[PDB]
Paper text:
To assure that the overall fold of the lysine‐mutated αSyn amyloids had not changed, we solved the cryo‐EM structure of the K21A αSyn amyloid in the presence of ATP to 3.13 Å resolution. The structure reveals a type‐1A fold but without the extra N‐terminal β‐strand comprising residues 16‐22. Still, we detected density for ATP, in the same cavity as found with the WT αSyn amyloids, implying that ATP binds but is not hydrolyzed. In accord, the ATP molecule is found in a different orientation in the K21A amyloid as compared to in the WT αSyn amyloid (compare Figures 2C and 5C). In the K21A amyloid, the phosphates of ATP point inward toward His50, whereas in the WT αSyn structure, the ATP phosphate tail points outward toward the new β‐strand of N‐terminal residues. Interestingly, in the ATP‐K21A structure, there is a small rearrangement (with respect to the ‘normal’ type 1A‐fold) of the N‐terminal stretch (residues 42‐38) in the direction away from the cavity/ATP site. This is the opposite direction to the ‘fold‐over’/enclosing rearrangement of the N‐terminus observed in the WT αSyn‐ATP complex. The fact that ATP binds to the K21A amyloids, despite a lack of chemical reactivity, was independently confirmed in solution using the fluorescent analog MANT‐ATP, which has an environment‐sensitive fluorophore attached to the ribose moiety. Whereas we detect over 400 µm free phosphate after 3 h of incubation with WT αSyn amyloids, the mutant amyloids showed little to no phosphate generation during this time interval. The binding mode observed from the docking of Mg2+‐ATP into the closed cavity of the WT structure and the open cavity of the K21A αSyn mutant agreed with the distinct ATP orientations observed in each cryo‐EM structure.
Numbering used by the authors:
A (entry chain O), B (entry chain M), C (entry chain K), D (entry chain I), E (entry chain G), F (entry chain P), ...: 36 to 96
């Protein structure tokens, strides 16, 4: 159990991001597996479970 | 159990990011496995579970 | 059990990052395994679980 | 159990980072195993669990 | 059990880092094993668990 | 007299600007004179004349 | 007299700017004179004349 | 007289700027005169004339 | 008279600045005269004329 | 007269500056005269004229 009384709470917050990306050439070549690129300004909360951001895994057997 | 009374709390917070990325050429070449690139300005909270950011794993058997 | 009374708390916080990255050429070449690059300005909290940032593992058997 | 009364607490905090990285050429060549590069401005708190930042392991059997 | 009364506490904190890295050429060549490079401006707290920053291990059997 | 042959020229150019401004309160109080605020991402060329950006002058007699 | 043959020229150029400004309160109070604030990412070229950016002058008689 | 043959020229250029400014309170109080604040990422070229950036002058008689 | 043949030239260039400024309170109080503050990442070229950056003068008679 | 043949030249150049300024309180109090503060990462070239950066003068009669 969780109780908040009179309380101010911030969980998983992103307040203010300036990003510039200049690229003259970008290439992704993939065979199998996984690639994850460019995950930007991401916020999450999870309760009572696993939680993943920009996670990459090979094949599973 | 958790109790907050009259309390101000910040958990997993990112307040203010300026980013510049200049690249004349970017290449990812992948065979199998995993690649994770460029995860930027990420905030997370997890309760009662595992939590991963930019995790990369090889294959699993 | 956890109790906060009248208390101000910061856990896992990033307040203010200026980053510049200039590259004339970047290459990642991967065969199997894992590669993790560029994880920037990440904040996390985990309660009652494992927590990983930019973790990379080889294959698992 | 944990109790904070009237108390101000900072845990896992990064307040203010200026970074410049200039590279005329960067290459990662990987065969198996793991590579982790560039982990910058990261903050974490973990309660009652293991916690890793930029950890890298070879294969596991 | 832990109690803070009227107390100000800093644990795992980094307030203010200026970094410049100039490289005309960087290469990582890896076969098996693990490589960890450039872990910068990292702050962590762990309670009741092991905690590793920029840890690298060879394969495990 | 000016001549360009086969030539590529950039004069007064702004390619890429990301800006965030957060203010909880802004006030300008002015009595006479001049105030100039917030001039952002401005580009100009002038030929054979004077040119001013965000210039402010008091009264003239 | 000016001549460009086969030539690539950049004059007065700004390619890439990320800016964040956080203010909890801003006030300008002015009586007479001049105030100039926040001139950002400005590019200019002038030929055969005077040129000013963010210039401020008191009164003129 | 100016001549460029086969030539690459950069004059007055700003390629890459990441800026963060956090202020809990800013005040400018001015009586007469001049104030100039915050001029950022400015590029100028002037030919055959005077050129001023962030110049401030008291009154002129 | 100026001549460039086959030549690469950089004059007045700024390539790559990360800046953080944190202030809990800033005040400028001015009576007459001039104040100049915070001039950052400025580049200029002037030909055949005077050139000033962040210059401040008192009154002139 | 100036001549460049086959030549690479850098004049007035700044490639790569990381700056952090933390202040709990800043005040400028001015009566007459001049104040110049914080001039950072400035590059200039002047041909055939006087050139000043962050110059401050009292009143002139």
């Amino acid at each position: 159990g969780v109780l908040y009384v009179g309380s101010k709470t911030k969980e998983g917050v992103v307040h203010g991001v300036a990003t510039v990306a200049e690229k003259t050439k970008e290439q992704v070549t993939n065979v199998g597996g996984a690639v994850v690129t460019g995950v930007t300004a991401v916020a999450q909360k999870t309760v009572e479970g696993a939680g993943s951001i920009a996670a990459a895994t090979g094949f599973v057997k």
